[PDB]
Design a protein around this ligand. Structure first.
Ligand SMILES: *[C@@H]1O[C@H](CO[C@@H]2O[C@@H](C)[C@@H](O)[C@@H](O)[C@@H]2O)[C@@H](O[C@@H]2O[C@H](CO)[C@@H](O[C@@H]3O[C@H](CO[C@H]4O[C@H](CO)[C@@H](O)[C@H](O)[C@@H]4O[C@@H]4O[C@H](CO)[C@@H](O[C@@H]5O[C@H](CO)[C@H](O)[C@H](O)[C@H]5O)[C@H](O)[C@H]4NC(C)=O)[C@@H](O)[C@H](O[C@H]4O[C@H](CO)[C@@H](O)[C@H](O)[C@@H]4O[C@@H]4O[C@H](CO)[C@@H](O)[C@H](O)[C@H]4NC(C)=O)[C@@H]3O)[C@H](O)[C@H]2NC(C)=O)[C@H](O)[C@H]1NC(C)=O
Ligand SMILES: *[C@@H]1O[C@H](CO[C@@H]2O[C@@H](C)[C@@H](O)[C@@H](O)[C@@H]2O)[C@@H](O[C@@H]2O[C@H](CO)[C@@H](O[C@@H]3O[C@H](CO[C@H]4O[C@H](CO)[C@@H](O)[C@H](O)[C@@H]4O[C@@H]4O[C@H](CO)[C@@H](O[C@@H]5O[C@H](CO)[C@H](O)[C@H](O)[C@H]5O)[C@H](O)[C@H]4NC(C)=O)[C@@H](O)[C@H](O[C@H]4O[C@H](CO)[C@@H](O)[C@H](O)[C@@H]4O[C@@H]4O[C@H](CO)[C@@H](O)[C@H](O)[C@H]4NC(C)=O)[C@@H]3O)[C@H](O)[C@H]2NC(C)=O)[C@H](O)[C@H]1NC(C)=O
Ligand SMILES: *[C@@H]1O[C@H](CO)[C@@H](O[C@@H]2O[C@H](CO)[C@@H](O[C@@H]3O[C@H](CO)[C@@H](O)[C@H](O[C@H]4O[C@H](CO)[C@@H](O)[C@H](O)[C@@H]4O[C@@H]4O[C@H](CO)[C@@H](O)[C@H](O)[C@H]4NC(C)=O)[C@@H]3O)[C@H](O)[C@H]2NC(C)=O)[C@H](O)[C@H]1NC(C)=O
Ligand SMILES: *[C@@H]1O[C@H](CO)[C@@H](O)[C@H](O)[C@H]1NC(C)=O
Ligand SMILES: [Cl-]
Lengths: 215, 149, 215
């Protein structure tokens, strides 16, 4: 449908981290990266539009020389947490002499009705208690959109050794995922408490946690 | 014994024209020479006569998307070094990088020759080029350049 | 209209399905796919090699018109189960008039010490028992390579209402995944035994089963 472009700089527009959009102590940023800027036309211009309304206040970094002898230039627009969640479009317009016409890229939060995750912690299987380490599982399902943050905690500090699957599309159009916390078996049997924490837009205070311990 | 264009390393389907002051691999020809659309068989040693018998001049025909052409591979300090990143059928090449010893040295949005006007000992190393034919990443083979005094 | 296709066609070479390599009754296939074949130069010639030696048993599929006026053109080589698992390289060589030379592509099983999967079934959280469906969970971890197949059954019949996460790289270089089977709560309350079936080269007879029921 769209006739393909020739050489020239290229533009990549990146959204904010989910966890940054949801906790108000954090500062979420939209990031507009221009690569393949030649030394012959190294000057790059960033215009930034929210829903159509130009904004200024974007903080443009200075061009950095890449190992392949091209320039790379980043512009970082700080975003208001609620503007992102209400789903306002963010537009990076990149202008440069090697471009016949400026390049525009747009991003926004995935559209669709938000849905609250259900969170269930699952102890280690009985068969696993044979091993030196064991697996505490946190199942998170029924969420939409797929934007989410999941962490494990214990005694107020973040647990180290955990991996979380990518979001998977369940058959009702919602998403689930699983996160696995691996701990030494001593800590489980000695009876410490482990929490699985979940941040998602459709939860009250964008937060919930669920405890897990032996009994 | 003159090549038009000068490039002794060429690609399949490249036009060559050959000027005199013919023997192909020491053997007689059809005519008294235009290579319309080269093939690997057109490679080898070439010599000329109508005058005396000329020196031996080599024509290498290669297979590939890209070929790093030059008038020679050994240069004097301060000589001009002309590189052409030649694409098969002159197919449009974009985002072209010329590399030296594994590091991009010059970048071009559209294909362009990389002319170094004044060679130095820093310019010794292995070079290749690369780029995009549409959406396809393609690279030429390497060629060793060495700089002497 | 037509696209320019300046670089000619591209090749994507795909492996067999994990279950097809592991059950002797099934037929594993390597599939060479060629895209961006033009209308004007549509013929594709295939040469197939196993550890460098040419083989002639490949199947030629009719070419397929795509909705951008190119052909998708495919060749399918069935393979020997043991060869694939023994790490034989399968080379697809693709010839077309819009290329300066043949494109060659290779594929083998991932290399490195195979590691046995550990399989663990996990009953629903007590908090899910209020719902009308429950989630039975199968954790499969500690396996290498990532090639694996997971299915569920009850009482000699397949249970198909499940979803499985992709394999995830764990911190020791092995892989894990979760599979979630969703069943009507009545069925779990009746005392029915559900089973997680896992296939992987590092298992005995390429097969193992763990079971899960009300206690
Ligand atoms: C010359 O070199 C440069 C750079 O050099 C590099 O460094 C050297 C040493 C080498 O290692 C070299 O290989 C390195 O690249 C080359 O520049 C590269 O150019 C290519 C394109 O040719 C770019 O490739 C795209 O990458 C995208 C992903 O990029 C991110 O991830 C990679 C790793 O996978 C990182 O390396 C990048 O830096 C990017 O990482 C992200 O950066 C963000 C901004 O900082 C981070 O977000 C921010 O995080 C901070 C916190 O730090 C805050 O929280 C902010 O709020 C937050 O915004 C983010 O965390 C970080 N991610 C990480 C770390 O994972 C791909 O998306 C893209 O693919 C899309 O586009 C292709 C078209 O070309 C297409 O084919 C793909 O299919 C895909 O399609 C698109 O899909 C998207 C979404 O799915 C849709 O928009 C579209 O539908 C669709 N099509 C589109 C948009 O057209 C490419 O793979 C590469 O990023 C770029 N590198 C860098 C560093 O800029 C250059 O090419 C070289 N030139 C030559 C001539 O050789
Ligand atoms: C014109 O149109 C055509 C048709 O396009 C399509 O139709 C229209 C309507 C659109 O909707 C469009 O989106 C459709 O796709 C275009 O054709 C496409 O071209 C792109 C490239 O431009 C191809 O993209 C690659 O896809 C690979 C994965 O492909 C599979 O998955 C997708 C879905 O995700 C399917 O749609 C594909 O068909 C492939 O599906 C697989 O097919 C196999 C064979 O059928 C199946 O295996 C077999 O299964 C059967 C049963 O059916 C038997 O059991 C057999 O035993 C078994 O063999 C398999 O199951 C099936 N999977 C499914 C369905 O899930 C990507 O892997 C690839 O990415 C790699 O390469 C990129 C380079 O371009 C690079 O960016 C990536 O990083 C990645 O690179 C690799 O990374 C890995 C590690 O991550 C490394 O190991 C590698 O080293 C590394 N580099 C490589 C390999 O170079 C591509 O994204 C796309 O496949 C193709 N479509 C089709 C249908 O073939 C065409 O481009 C358009 N042209 C123009 C000019 O517009
Ligand atoms: C003047 O002198 C020069 C310099 O000596 C000659 O250059 C030589 O030309 C040869 C062919 O014309 C070049 O051969 C090519 O390069 C490969 C070297 O690695 C070579 O392996 C290839 O050779 C083919 O023929 C062999 C059979 O005898 C095969 O072993 C080989 O695989 C190739 O044949 C094909 O193989 C595939 C396998 O899948 C078959 O399916 C095909 O059917 C086979 N045939 C065809 C037609 O494809 C390759 O062609 C040689 O390298 C080159 N040397 C140099 C240094 O450049 C000039 O030709 C000569 N000029 C004249 C007019 O005589
Ligand atoms: C082509 O492939 C090389 C090899 O990995 C990579 O470094 C390069 O950036 C790719 N793209 C271009 C345009 O050169
Ligand atoms: Cl990202």
């Amino acid at each position: 449908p769209a006739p393909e472009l020739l050489g020239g700089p290229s533009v990549f527009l990146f959204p904010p981290k989910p966890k940054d959009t949801l906790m108000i102590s954090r500062t979420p940023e939209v990031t507009c990266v221009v690569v393949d800027v030649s030394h012959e036309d190294p000057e790059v211009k960033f215009n930034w539009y929210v829903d159509g309304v130009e904004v200024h206040n974007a903080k443009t970094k200075p061009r950095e020389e890449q190992w392949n002898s091209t320039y790379r230039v980043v512009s970082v627009l700080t975003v208001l947490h609620q503007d992102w969640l209400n789903g306002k479009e963010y537009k990076c317009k990149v202008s440069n002499k090697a471009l016949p016409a400026p390049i525009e890229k747009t991003i926004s939060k995935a559209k669709g009705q938000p849905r609250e995750p259900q969170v269930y912690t699952l102890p280690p299987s009985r068969d696993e208690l044979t091993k030196n380490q064991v697996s505490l599982t946190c199942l998170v399902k029924g969420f939409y959109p797929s934007d989410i943050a999941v962490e494990w905690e214990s005694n107020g500090q973040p647990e180290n050794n955990y991996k979380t699957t990518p979001p998977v599309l369940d058959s009702d159009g919602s998403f689930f995922l699983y996160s696995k916390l691996t701990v030494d078996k001593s800590r489980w049997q000695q009876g410490n408490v482990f929490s699985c924490s979940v941040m998602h837009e459709a939860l009250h205070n964008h937060y919930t946690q669920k405890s897990l311990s032996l009994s | 014994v003159f090549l038009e264009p000068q490039w002794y390393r060429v690609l399949e389907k490249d036009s060559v024209t050959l000027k005199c002051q013919w023997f192909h691999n020491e053997s007689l020809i059809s005519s008294q020479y235009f290579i319309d659309a080269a093939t690997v068989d057109d490679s080898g040693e070439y010599r000329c006569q109508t005058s005396t018998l000329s020196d031996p001049v080599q024509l290498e025909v290669h297979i590939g998307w890209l070929l790093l052409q030059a008038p020679r591979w050994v240069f004097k300090e301060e000589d001009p070094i002309h590189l052409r990143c030649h694409s098969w059928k002159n197919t449009a090449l974009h985002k072209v990088t010329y590399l030296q010893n594994g590091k991009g040295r010059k970048y071009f949005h559209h294909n362009s020759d990389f002319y170094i006007p004044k060679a130095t000992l820093k310019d010794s190393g292995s070079y290749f080029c690369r780029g995009l034919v549409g959406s396809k990443n393609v690279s030429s083979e390497t060629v060793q350049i060495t700089i002497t005094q």
